Amino acid sequence: LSSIATVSWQMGTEQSVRFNGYPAMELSGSPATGVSTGQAMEAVQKMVDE
Amino acid sequence: VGSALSAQNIQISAGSIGSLPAVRGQTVTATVTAQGQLGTAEEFGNVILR
């Protein structure tokens, strides 16, 4: 098998997810004390728009 | 043509290396990947018929 293939070590994902038909990756967060959830959500949306 | 195209473009599922029966003393697990499919036309044009 060495004369036809090149088996080698590699780094790869061990779990795959999809949300509404598109590949998705989930990350969590926690708002700081004194800041409303609406501001946090707007900031996250702006960052995503970045 | 049909047989050559169908017996030469197929996915391979190779499994894992440290399967769970796991003869005593095993300390690591891996995964094996093949990718035996064709994606572009310049390589569909190189299939072997005879």
JSON list of C-alpha atoms in Angstrom, two decimals, chain A residues 9-10 14, chain B residues 30-31 33:
[
{"chain": "A", "resi": 9, "resn": "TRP", "atom": "CA", "xyz": [-0.97, 12.02, 10.26]},
{"chain": "A", "resi": 10, "resn": "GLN", "atom": "CA", "xyz": [-3.31, 15.00, 10.12]},
{"chain": "A", "resi": 14, "resn": "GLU", "atom": "CA", "xyz": [-14.42, 15.09, 15.32]},
{"chain": "B", "resi": 30, "resn": "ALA", "atom": "CA", "xyz": [-7.50, 7.67, 15.78]},
{"chain": "B", "resi": 31, "resn": "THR", "atom": "CA", "xyz": [-9.65, 7.87, 12.65]},
{"chain": "B", "resi": 33, "resn": "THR", "atom": "CA", "xyz": [-10.14, 8.79, 5.95]}
]
